[PDB]
Amino acid sequence: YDYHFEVNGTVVRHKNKGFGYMERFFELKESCDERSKLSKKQYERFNALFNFFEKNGVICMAKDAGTLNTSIEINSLAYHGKYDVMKKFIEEQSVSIEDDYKKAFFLACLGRWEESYDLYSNIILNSINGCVYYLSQINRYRIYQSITQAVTQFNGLGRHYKPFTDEFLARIEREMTNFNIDDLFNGMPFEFQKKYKILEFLSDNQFLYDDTVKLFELTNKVSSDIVVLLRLYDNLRFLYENCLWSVSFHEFHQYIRNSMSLLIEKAEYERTRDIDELGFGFFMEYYDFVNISRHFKIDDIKNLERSCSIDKIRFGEQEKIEEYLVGIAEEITKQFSANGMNVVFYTQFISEAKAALYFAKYVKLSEEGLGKIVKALLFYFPERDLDIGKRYVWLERLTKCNELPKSIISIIDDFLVLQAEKHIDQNYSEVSSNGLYSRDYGALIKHFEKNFISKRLSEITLCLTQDKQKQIDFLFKLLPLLSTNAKSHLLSFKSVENINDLMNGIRIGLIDEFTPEHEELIIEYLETRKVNYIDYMSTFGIWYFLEEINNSKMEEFIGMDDQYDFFVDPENFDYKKFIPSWLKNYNDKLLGKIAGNKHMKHHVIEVLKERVKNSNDKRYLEILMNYFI
Amino acid sequence: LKEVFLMLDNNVVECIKEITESSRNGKLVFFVGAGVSTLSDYPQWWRLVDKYHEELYGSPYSSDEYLRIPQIFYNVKGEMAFDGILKDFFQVDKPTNPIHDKILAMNPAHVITTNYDNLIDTACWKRGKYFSVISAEEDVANATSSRYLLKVHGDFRKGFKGENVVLKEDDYLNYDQNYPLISNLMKTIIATHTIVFIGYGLGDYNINMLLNWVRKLQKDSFHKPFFIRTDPSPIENETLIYYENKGLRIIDAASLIDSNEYDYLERYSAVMDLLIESQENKFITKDDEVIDYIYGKISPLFALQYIRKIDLKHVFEYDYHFEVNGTVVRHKNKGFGYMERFFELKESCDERSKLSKKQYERFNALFNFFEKNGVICMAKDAGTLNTSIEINSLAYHGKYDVMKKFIEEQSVSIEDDYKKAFFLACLGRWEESYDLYSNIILNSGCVYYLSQINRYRIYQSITQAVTQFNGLGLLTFGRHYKPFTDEFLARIEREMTNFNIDDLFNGMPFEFQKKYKILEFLSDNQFLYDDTVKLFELTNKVRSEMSEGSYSFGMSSDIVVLLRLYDNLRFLYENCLWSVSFHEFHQYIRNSMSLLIEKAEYERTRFFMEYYDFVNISRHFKIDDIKNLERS
Amino acid sequence: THDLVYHSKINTFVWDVEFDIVLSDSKELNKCYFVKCFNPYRINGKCDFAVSSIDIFSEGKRLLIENEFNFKITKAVHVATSKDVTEIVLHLSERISSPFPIVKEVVYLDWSHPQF
């Protein structure tokens, strides 16, 4: 405690009352003339001292601070996700016990926890400065904790996996029975406990309590943002460059989640506060992208998107982010295209894999890279984590910064054709947690091209017969992609005889234009309902207002459904029967069409004004704000 | 084994108890004999005697013959021949038997052994334990670690030489002369620790020598060492009493289990495995025992006015989750559930009378503590849980005059001064607070530790205020205010210059460190860590709920934040800790309330303000903090 | 009713319940629920009007609604606690005046959309 060593590298005299050695050392560093006054032994010691301080980013005192450059550089293959390189490093024969320690962290990082536990046990045997011995004891206990946690997780949960043999599980329990990590530091040689007092915190259960409590300042509404960020980088560099397995535990991942989020929200608050007074902050880099990808869950990113506006946050080192994104997408191909899936390495990596591509919306990607991410996401991502419904959203997010070109369109077309290929089986059915299916991908291509025709799908459509019904109705959701010959061939398999077939046709996109026949079919259903008076009725009303129907014989059935007459004739509609709940069910196009009608507008703007004042509903407020309905 | 424990003799279970408590306390030492080494097929000394006999007379034993024939061989054949036979017999590799692993699994403070092999050494390295191995005179001074692996008879690390080891006669005769430091170290370890003899026969020479020295010690100045007897036959009753009076507490393996004559490994394991599995077991069976165990954990907390419920999981070593709503949930208690049994006695009045006369009043003290602290029952017995929040502290309620009068009264106990010092701090008389806290430290051990923490905290407050007043107080006030004289500043600087708050807990008697583990978090901001992590987690959860427009019917999500907020305020104020003035603690209170009001406003348009809520915002919010809420 | 959550972006209720319903064709379905998907930026056709797409699942499998889906609730069972909750569903069904009142889970596609 003789000095403060600030995160920007400035030393401050704190508590020492003797000679100022740190001030004297920096004077020796700046000018070389006094350096020659030292003895030869002290000259080489100063060079070693000078190397340590420049490598650790401690440059000078506070009062000599000038143009400070605090750029985070983590020299660790594990942090960058260089999965191939660490495999090669593990494969090579290790020269020294320091290389073994790096190997065991890499084995732990690659899901080979049994091998790292054996390696850490080996290092402990051969290492009795004794600093690697202590660090291996910390890491072996940490990996034993990870193995025990993974065994419990796997027993609770898609298929039954047994990554660790029960012989290995029984062995590590007998080696780690009644093992105290708390007594580890105290039982070390007294020379170690003096020289390496700063390593004691690794034996504690929690070591980021100080960093988490200091995060409270980021919520102050009255630099510090640089202090929290540099403190975060300090924790990352120490835990990764020194190869400590605690960097993969829940406490550290949550701490990065808390510190990164609060830094983002604080910068968001500063921007809005600035605009309030100035009337028109956080700049992410490659390391921030990795930190969000590795440590944030998809829900945690979602809490970020709703609270703040990351689209206002500018992303730097996009080629390094792209290299990270092409580098990660390569590993998915290795994990699933081949039989190289490591079930333990699976659990940790897929969460980072999902988060990186979800966060890849905000980064500009080159075409060659974008092909690799898209092809790895579309084809090689297992359906258990990213199903058909969620995968399009990951794919569709990449279009925010990268407007879909031809090459990516081909890949999605490849995906669509492969989706048609799996439909030869009648049992096969797409399972989506988002209510979102293969039709949405084709809509995306038609959105970005408006003229793309799927040749291979046309071949599959033309080959179709009446037998394989699962293929027929699947491609009816892909009608715009088919050619005219394929369109004519497919339409022969369905009929529009009764009203129900019309609704099925309108839902699957079988027909998009109303010939006069369906109007009569539309008309016939309504007279039956009118006769039987003493779901669809509201649906028909919208189509008349949307100019989908020009039969003009719609007013005969005015008086049954309050939504029907509300759409057929807004001028004559009574708005005391109006319910504000409808506007919540209406999409972008319909609400905008109501806004420009010049009828119904002042009534609904009054109902929306009443609702927000009485209830303060954000959906009502945003519906009123965006379209002025 | 669990069955074997069930009908274990009451004496053996008591013997198992004291061994286990010593192992937890870190003061267990194992005296390992040749029997454990023989289990690993190490060359027994009787075959060394046989070889020496063959090379002496040509044809192949009392107690002294084990010592005399090697001495005869050493005298007439020489040192080279004696060590030559030593090398070709003892230079072998042998695997460590599981008993070596089970000995280390007991976590012994030191390992004293008469074996000259390295079997314990390699067993220690495989396990990862670090022991400073001492087998010669110079190793005692050059020991690099507190933990000692004491080979009182030497070993062959220097070489397979007769001088390095105590093997023959004239080595046992001159043992005290050639090993004064090692013998002193062994006696010192035995005096200060609890000793378990394993691998030794009851008639072993070393056991008698140690029992001979023990009789010299005055009555009850030493702990009676523990002896693990692994002879195939059950110990005779008359022999047992003889050695118990000599000073040994004998645990007989042959009496514990039925075993074969030559199956020594099962005999050693049956006691080692029973010892190992008793580490987690609480020896908890009857209701009187259950109250006794819970009382031992809770009774030290009676010194404190209030305990945070989240802190109670540390008291019982993560056995349960103590929820802020007052519900107890099984977390890591694999043994008998004493908390369930405790509340079963609480709900059922008839079973309370079943308890003994002592355990009845101990339960009553536990009942008042658990009811005062807001611990009700388990989660599965939870009903409508509504607890009013109340803080019995004058500092919290702003009764400045009442606290001023309280200082004027004469103190009747040491807790009276401790409350007075906190009130002096809350009234800005930090000088009177500091020297008062100094007086409590002199006359004080719960109050001692808390006064030291508060004195350091008030010292930091004075130093910060002095720096402010010197640097900005002249400009802020228009006058250079001098509330503290340089004599006061110099004196508090001198005392607190070498004081470290981090080692204050570690620099305490082990009884304090185990009874008051929850108080260690007050040295730093670690006591706020769990609530800070929880607050950040629910804040994201609550804000996500408001963002999506969801409304939940039933329990309100911020009730965890609401209860944790008053858990810290009640703990810090009623215990009179100066942490209430922490900038970080103020931020924690400000963030918790701000989340509560935002959720209430979100729910209002779909919680109300009390006296306690008004004080929290008044004390812990800045003006810009309140303005932010009024905007939103 | 302790798991019951009201979403206000779509005036529906989230509840861990199943439904036994009969359509207008006397067909019976047992242990069925619904999931709603708020996707305001969906690439709509010329004839898509509703902001939410709903999938009906019975026996863990989604249904292809080829006919009219007018239906009445005959018995609603809360999954976590087997107490019959049908009376609450019908009471809630009348109030919200929206199609498919009680839904197993609502999926919000707005926050994940690139146009968000």
* One-letter-per-residue 3-state SS of A520-572: HHHHHHHHHHHHCCCCHHHHHHHHHHCCCCCCCCCHHHCCCCHHHHHHHCCCC
How many residues can be counted in chain C?
Answer: 116
Going by their DSSP bridges, the two strands C28-38 and C52-58 should be labelled as antiparallel
Q: Report yes or no: B596 and B562 within 8 Å, Cβ to Cβ.
A: yes
Single-letter amino acid, residue B242: Y
Residues linked to residue B134 through DSSP beta bridges, in sequence order: B150
Let me know the angle formed at the C-alpha of B400 by B399 and B404, rounded to the nearest 5 degrees: 120
Tokens of A17: 């009352």
Query: What is the end-to-end Cα distance of chain A in Å, rounded?
Result: 65
Chain A interface mutation, best of B460, B540, B544, highest count of A Cβ atoms under 10 Å: B540
Quick check: is B418 catalytic?
Answer: no
CB atoms under 10 Å from CB of B456, counted, come to 18
Residues linked to residue C57 through DSSP beta bridges, in sequence order: C33, C62
C-alpha span between A365 and B47 (Å, rounded): 79
Q: Report yes or no: B155 and B138 within 8 Å, Cβ to Cβ.
A: no
C-alpha span between B88 and A87 (Å, rounded): 46
Q: Mapping DSSP to helix (H, G, I), strand (E, B) and coil, where does residue A514 land?
A: coil
Short-list A319, A235, A237, CA closest to A73 = A237
Q: Mapping DSSP to helix (H, G, I), strand (E, B) and coil, where does residue B179 land?
A: coil
List own/partner pairs for B155-161 with CB under 8 A and 24 or more apart: B155/B115, B155/B116, B155/B117, B155/B118, B156/B86, B156/B90, B156/B91, B156/B116, B156/B117, B156/B118, B157/B118, B157/B133, B160/B83, B160/B86, B160/B87, B160/B90, B160/B91, B161/B79, B161/B83, B161/B86
Single-letter amino acid, residue B122: T
Which H or E run includes A10?
A: strand A10-13
Q: Mapping DSSP to helix (H, G, I), strand (E, B) and coil, where does residue A18 land?
A: coil
Closest Cβ opposite residue C7 in set B549, B553, B555: B549
Q: Report yes or no: A234 and A287 within 8 Å, Cβ to Cβ.
A: no
Tokens of B23: 């192992």
CB atoms under 10 Å from CB of B49, counted, come to 21
Short-list A196, A300, A289, A184, CA closest to A250 = A300
Q: Is A217 on the interface with B (CB under 8 A)?
A: yes
C-alpha span between A510 and A202 (Å, rounded): 64
Tokens of B554: 């039933």
Q: Report yes or no: B610 and B596 within 8 Å, Cβ to Cβ.
A: no
B400 alpha carbon, distance to own chain's centre: 41
Chain C interface mutation, best of B385, B552, B555, B606, highest count of C Cβ atoms under 10 Å: B552
DSSP state of C33: E
Q: Is B553 within 8 Å of C7 when comparing Cβ atoms?
A: no
DSSP state of B483: S
Residues 6 or more apart whose CB falls under 8 angstroms from that of B418 comprise B440, B447, B450, B451, B576
Residues 6 or more apart whose CB falls under 8 angstroms from that of A125 comprise B125, B126
Residues 6 or more apart whose CB falls under 8 angstroms from that of B142 comprise none
DSSP string, B34-93: HHHHHHTT---HHHHHHHHHHHHHS----TTHHHHHHHHHHHHH-HHHHHHHHHHHH---
Tokens of B5: 């424990």
C-alpha span between A308 and B468 (Å, rounded): 37
| CB neighbour burial string for A270-294, b if at least 16 within 10 angstroms, e if fewer | ebeeeeeeeeeebebbbbbbbbbbb
Chain C interface mutation, best of B543, B547, B550, highest count of C Cβ atoms under 10 Å: B550
Going by their DSSP bridges, the two strands B28-32 and C105-108 should be labelled as unpaired
DSSP state of B472: I
Tokens of C40: 């305001």
Tokens of A61: 């005192």
Q: Is B591 on the interface with A (CB under 8 A)?
A: yes
Closest Cβ opposite residue C46 in set A397, A548, A587: A548
Resolution in A: 2.6
In the block, residue with structure tokens 């692994």: B230
CB atoms under 10 Å from CB of B568, counted, come to 20
How many A-B residue pairs are in contact by the CB < 8 A criterion?
105
Searching chain C, which residue's CA lies closest to the CA of residue B548? Answer: C9
Going by their DSSP bridges, the two strands A3-5 and B249-252 should be labelled as unpaired
C-alpha span between A128 and A142 (Å, rounded): 20
- Alpha-carbon distances of B208 from A418, A432, B563, rounded to whole Å: 85, 79, 63
> Torsion-angle region of residue A621: left (phi > 0), alpha (psi -120 to 50) or beta?
alpha
CB atoms under 10 Å from CB of B17, counted, come to 12
Q: Report yes or no: A478 and A442 within 8 Å, Cβ to Cβ.
A: yes
Single-letter amino acid, residue A455: K
Q: Is A400 within 8 Å of C115 when comparing Cβ atoms?
A: yes
Distance from CA of C72 to the nearest CA of A (A): 13
Q: Is A125 within 8 Å of B524 when comparing Cβ atoms?
A: no
Q: Is B550 within 8 Å of C4 when comparing Cβ atoms?
A: no
Going by their DSSP bridges, the two strands C5-7 and C12-14 should be labelled as antiparallel
CB atoms under 10 Å from CB of A132, counted, come to 18
Q: Report yes or no: A431 and A456 within 8 Å, Cβ to Cβ.
A: no
A324 alpha carbon, distance to own chain's centre: 14
C-alpha span between A392 and B460 (Å, rounded): 57
**Dihedral pair phi/psi, residue A209, rounded to 5°:** -65, -40
Tell me the CB-side half-sphere exposure of residue A113, using CA atoms within 13 A.
30
List own/partner pairs for A18-26 with CB under 8 A and 24 or more apart: A22/A61, A23/A61, A25/A49, A26/A60, A26/A61, A26/A64
From chain A, the residues in CB contact with C67 under 8 A are: 500
- Alpha-carbon distances of A355 from A253, A302, A325, B77, rounded to whole Å: 13, 10, 11, 79
Quick check: is B117 catalytic?
Answer: yes
Dihedral over Cα of B516, B520, B526, B527: its sign: positive
Short-list B69, B41, B37, B67, CA closest to B55 = B69
Q: Report yes or no: B156 and B167 within 8 Å, Cβ to Cβ.
A: no
Residues 6 or more apart whose CB falls under 8 angstroms from that of B382 comprise B325, B326, B327, B376
From chain A, the residues in CB contact with B118 under 8 A are: none
Distance from CA of A254 to the nearest CA of C (A): 22
C-alpha span between B294 and B287 (Å, rounded): 11
Residues linked to residue A5 through DSSP beta bridges, in sequence order: A11
Q: Is A615 on the interface with B (CB under 8 A)?
A: yes
Using only the alpha carbons of chain C, give its radius of gyration: 15
Quick check: is B401 catalytic?
Answer: no
Going by their DSSP bridges, the two strands B148-151 and C5-7 should be labelled as unpaired
Sheet holding B377-378, edge to edge: B320-322, B327-330, B377-378
Tokens of B550: 């969801």
Q: Is B550 within 8 Å of C108 when comparing Cβ atoms?
A: no
* One-letter-per-residue 3-state SS of B377-423: EECCCCCCCCCCCCCCCHHHHCCHHHHHHHHHCCCCCHHHHHHHHHH
C-alpha span between A178 and B23 (Å, rounded): 10
**Dihedral pair phi/psi, residue A225, rounded to 5°:** -60, -35
Short-list A248, A329, A363, CA closest to A295 = A248
In the block, residue with structure tokens 């509560």: B596
How many residues can be counted in chain A?
Answer: 629
Residues linked to residue B132 through DSSP beta bridges, in sequence order: B148
List own/partner pairs for B89-96 with CB under 8 A and 24 or more apart: B89/B43, B89/B47, B89/B48, B89/B51, B90/B43, B90/B116, B90/B117, B90/B156, B90/B160, B91/B156, B91/B160, B92/B42, B92/B43, B94/B40, B94/B41, B94/B42, B94/B119, B95/B40, B96/B40, B96/B120, B96/B122, B96/B123, B96/B126
User: Technique behind this structure?
Assistant: cryo-EM
Q: Report yes or no: B321 and B329 within 8 Å, Cβ to Cβ.
A: yes
Scan residues 80-139 of A and list those with Cβ closer than 8 Å to B: 121, 124-125, 128, 133, 137
Active-site residue (options: B153, B295, B434, B448): B153
C-alpha span between B361 and B349 (Å, rounded): 14
Alpha helices (H) along A202-285: 209-213, 224-241, 250-278
Query: What is the end-to-end Cα distance of chain C in Å, rounded?
Result: 33
DSSP state of B625: H
Tokens of B493: 């600087």
Q: Report yes or no: A437 and A388 within 8 Å, Cβ to Cβ.
A: yes
Residues linked to residue C84 through DSSP beta bridges, in sequence order: C77
Q: Is A450 on the interface with C (CB under 8 A)?
A: no
Tokens of A13: 């005299």
From chain A, the residues in CB contact with C98 under 8 A are: 581, 584-585
C-alpha span between B412 and C24 (Å, rounded): 85
Q: Report yes or no: B10 and B282 within 8 Å, Cβ to Cβ.
A: no
Tokens of B148: 């000692």
How many A-C residue pairs are in contact by the CB < 8 A criterion?
110
Alpha helices (H) along A342-437: 343-359, 367-378, 388-397, 406-421
> Torsion-angle region of residue B50: left (phi > 0), alpha (psi -120 to 50) or beta?
alpha
C-alpha span between A117 and A255 (Å, rounded): 26
CA dihedral B518, B524, B527, B533 (to 10 degrees): -140
**Residues on C contacting B at a C-beta cutoff of 8 Å:** 1-2, 4-9, 14, 108
Q: Mapping DSSP to helix (H, G, I), strand (E, B) and coil, where does residue B485 land?
A: coil
From chain B, the residues in CB contact with C14 under 8 A are: 550
Residues 6 or more apart whose CB falls under 8 angstroms from that of A233 comprise A72, A74, A287
Going by their DSSP bridges, the two strands B132-134 and B110-113 should be labelled as unpaired
Tell the burial category of A414 from Cβ atoms under 10 Å away from its Cβ (0-12, 13-18, 19+): middle
C-alpha span between A266 and A225 (Å, rounded): 8
CB atoms under 10 Å from CB of A198, counted, come to 8
Q: Is B529 within 8 Å of A213 when comparing Cβ atoms?
A: yes
Let me know the angle formed at the C-alpha of B533 by B530 and B534, rounded to the nearest 5 degrees: 85
Tokens of C26: 């006397």
How many residues can be counted in chain B?
Answer: 632
Q: Mapping DSSP to helix (H, G, I), strand (E, B) and coil, where does residue B608 land?
A: coil
In the block, residue with structure tokens 């579309």: A378
Scan residues 264-303 of B and list those with Cβ closer than 8 Å to A: 276, 279
CB atoms under 10 Å from CB of B87, counted, come to 12
Let me know the angle formed at the C-alpha of B609 by B603 and B613, rounded to the nearest 5 degrees: 120
Residues linked to residue C24 through DSSP beta bridges, in sequence order: none
Tokens of C51: 């902001």
